[PDB]
Each structure stands twice: as C-alpha cells, then as structure tokens.
Write a protein that binds this ligand. Structure first.
Ligand SMILES: Cc1cc2c(cc1C)N(C[C@H](O)[C@H](O)[C@H](O)COP(=O)(O)O)c1[nH]c(=O)[nH]c(=O)c1N2
Ligand SMILES: Cc1cc2c(cc1C)N(C[C@H](O)[C@H](O)[C@H](O)COP(=O)(O)O)c1[nH]c(=O)[nH]c(=O)c1N2
Lengths: 219, 219
C-alpha cells in the first residue's frame, strides 16, 4: 500500500472527459489500421479490469480479415431482420433506418469472451452468483472503450446476432461464452450525445429520479 | 457530429492512471462521508455509460444508515461462511483471512440495480441475449469505479450474498435485479497491485496467453 489519492484537477478532468465523450461508433470508422503497439495498450487496459476472485476469465480473439468479417456481418443481418420484425408501424421504420454496426467498415474487431470454468472448482464472488465472472468480463470492455476514446479510437459494441453462429464462425468452445463483439477503428468525428438520442430513438433519462435514498423507490 | 481525435499525452496519461491504479478497496475506507456534490459526479459518470437500446436500465440506491449496513453486513456473513465452507486446507484458512468487504466501514454504500423490464416490451439490441441489459449496468459500475478513483474515492464490489436477502432489506421489487453492491469511501492508501495477488491468493495472468488471432486457440 501507499499514497492517498485524489487526482489533480487536470487528471480528474481528463478521466471525466473520456467518460463523458465516448460513444458507440457504427458508421464513422476510418480505414487506417491500428498499430500492434496501440492494440496492445488497448488490450492492456482491458486486462487491468477487476474480476471476481481475480479469475481473469477473459479472452480476446482479434479479427482482421475480410472473409471472417463478411460471415459475421452476414450473421448480423438475419439477426437484425428478426429484430426489426419486433417493431411495427413507425418505430420499425426508425429501427430499420438506424446504423447498428460497422463490422465491415472498421479495420479491427475484437471478440471478448468469458471462460465459465477458468481457475478452479470454487471461487470468490462466483459462489451463489454465477453472473459475476461475466460481469467481470464487461468491466474489461468498459475499460477498453475508455482507453480507446483516449487513444482517439472508436469502439462499437455489436450484440445483434445468434451467439451460436458467431461461436461457430470463431470456433469457440461451448464451455466458453461471448460477452461482446467489438468493432474498432480511429474516428475523427464523434456525436456530442448518444447517436441513438440524436436520431430520435430514445432520450437521456433524468438521473434525478433514478436515485433512491436508503430504500427502493424513496426519493 | 463534431470534430474529434485523441487526447493529449497528458490527458491520455490521466485516463490510464485511473484504469491502472483503481482497486477493489475493502479494509482501508476512511470515515468522512462523501459530500453530496461528489456523489452527483460519480452517479453522473455511471449514467454516462452506454446501454443496449440506450435503455438505461439502472437505478442507484444510496445506503448511508447504520441499521442498513448492519443488516447487509449480516446477510454477507451468512453467505460468506457458507462460501468459506466450499474450500479446504490452507486454501480455506486462506480464504477465511481475506477481508472481502467494508460494508460497516465505508461511510456510503450504493446498490446498483437493473430493471429487467425497462425499455418497453421489446428493447433495441436485445433478444440475441437478454442479459445485455445487466451488462450495460456493469459499464455504469465500472465508470463509477474509475471516476471515484480519480476522486480519490476507494470502491469495492461485494457480491457475496443471497440476492433475495438484500432485496428484502431495501425492498427491491421483482422486475428489478441487483447487479452490484458497492462500498464507497475516501481512501488514504491503495495496494500497488491487486490485493488478492499481494496475499498470494491468485496471480495476474500473462496477457499474451489470452490474445488470439482470427480464431479461438490460434496465437
Ligand atoms: C451491452 C451493450 C450492447 C449494445 C450497446 C450497448 C451496450 C451497453 N450498443 C450501444 C448503445 O446503443 C449505446 O450505448 C446507446 O445508444 C448510447 O451510446 P453512447 O452513449 O453513445 O455510448 C449497441 N449499439 C449498436 O449499434 N448495436 C448493438 O448491437 C449494441 N449493443
Ligand atoms: C463482478 C465482480 C465482483 C466482485 C469483485 C470483482 C468483480 C469484477 N471483487 C473484487 C475482486 O476481488 C478484485 O477484482 C481482485 O481482488 C483484484 O482486482 P483489483 O484490481 O484489486 O480490483 C470482489 N471483492 C470482494 O472483496 N468481494 C466480492 O464479493 C467481490 N465481487
């Protein structure tokens, strides 16, 4: 141990800045590839996330080739067609008009998975609450996302697709689970608020009535 | 949109410092209570996390009272011993020596929840996994975890308990689910590396072993 620790005003501002400015990026990806050194720093961030029992259940399968990004994209559509069919009248139109991935456009894609049996037979956290290993994995992702914003790299989480297909296309064991598919690529333009809000799909909720005092539903 | 690019060297360094020094703090929480202005910032960070279909499924229940922390600490006890009994040998006595919560010590606790039904009948980005909603909530948590470090606020995740027992305490309805119970409080010091690694319970896996290329198992 050592060092108390409030950051300086400048450091504090930067952290907040990464937090207040990252976005899910679908259509503004740049073709320029990321250096091996950059990717390492982004995965290095991810790897420094907390994880239940410190089992560090994650794996990152990097995807860089056209054949693969084509099969996955095909896997997206199909899934997205089904999704669309869940909305009627007006909404559907809107849904079917949104951009929900840039699988093809983005140079690098990362498939972050969770090994449901990493470590031993028992473990902390993951005792009566199995989800924790997965939750640990999502933290990994959030970290990547922020470090990415910092690096001027765009990131997009795509979740519209049958896991089995993606697992098959990547040859992932069934004892292993996909937490997230991430599209990555530099970006020079960013929405100043959630795109999904801008395109009028859903607004930002007022935090003030999402916060309770000492007991559920108590303001 | 709006023009955008990488952070400056200085800023970039700040972001990585939060990602690099935050710890699950258990036993070194300080007594002073977080000012209201501070809390709003942390909650603001979490609220600026992404969320499938921009559904924003979270709710935060602030727990500042002793009777509440007492009860929860107890729920923790029950579950933790039960957990303990899943080990044997030095490993059990080992476990039984790890401080795995600061419920009674941290001046503030936050129960981060996930409304499983918010976002209408059928939300965007979901169906090809109904847990993306929970996942989203985690991102909120991780953002809170990171901002807090910059705020010089230690945070620890406590998952060791039977959810229903915690839901009863705070009266959390059925459609909502607990994703995390976070103990917050100012710290005066941090472990330079993960504490479980310091206590020889488990080490940092070598990141190179986890990174694959194009397909599972391929290095
Ligand atoms: C777990 C999870 C999964 C997804 C998302 C998010 C999260 C948290 N998001 C991005 C989502 O739509 C986005 O967070 C909101 O629209 C607001 O984004 P930003 O505030 O700009 O990050 C998303 N976006 C998209 O275009 N296709 C997808 O399949 C998903 N899936
Ligand atoms: C989803 C999830 C859930 C838990 C944790 C983490 C995560 C990601 N951790 C914290 C964990 O023990 C910690 O990550 C490791 O000790 C090392 O990571 P740090 O870098 O120190 O945070 C944790 N710690 C603890 O004392 N009791 C608990 O119930 C849990 N549960």
């Amino acid at each position: 141990l050592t060092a108390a620790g409030a950051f300086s005003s400048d450091e504090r501002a930067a952290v907040y800045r990464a937090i207040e400015t990252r976005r899910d990026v679908r259509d503004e990806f740049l073709p320029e590839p990321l250096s091996e050194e950059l990717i390492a720093r982004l995965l290095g961030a991810a790897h420094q996330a907390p994880s239940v029992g410190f089992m560090q259940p994650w794996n990152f399968v990097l995807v860089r080739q056209d054949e693969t990004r084509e099969k996955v994209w095909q896997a997206f559509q199909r899934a997205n067609d089904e999704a669309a069919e869940m909305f009627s009248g007006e909404r559907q139109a809107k849904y079917r008009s949104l951009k929900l991935e840039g699988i093809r456009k983005a140079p690098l894609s990362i498939c972050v998975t969770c090994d449901r049996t990493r470590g031993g037979a028992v473990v902390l956290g993951r005792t009566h609450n199995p989800q924790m290993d997965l939750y640990s994995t999502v933290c990994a992702v959030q970290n990547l996302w922020l470090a990415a914003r910092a690096e001027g790299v765009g990131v997009g989480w795509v979740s519209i697709f049958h896991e089995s297909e993606i697992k098959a296309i990547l040859g992932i064991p069934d004892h292993v689970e996909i937490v997230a598919w991430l599209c990555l690529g530099f970006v020079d333009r960013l929405y100043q608020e959630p795109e999904l809000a801008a395109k009028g799909w859903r607004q930002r909720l007022p935090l003030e009535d999402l916060v309770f005092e000492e007991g559920w539903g108590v303001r």
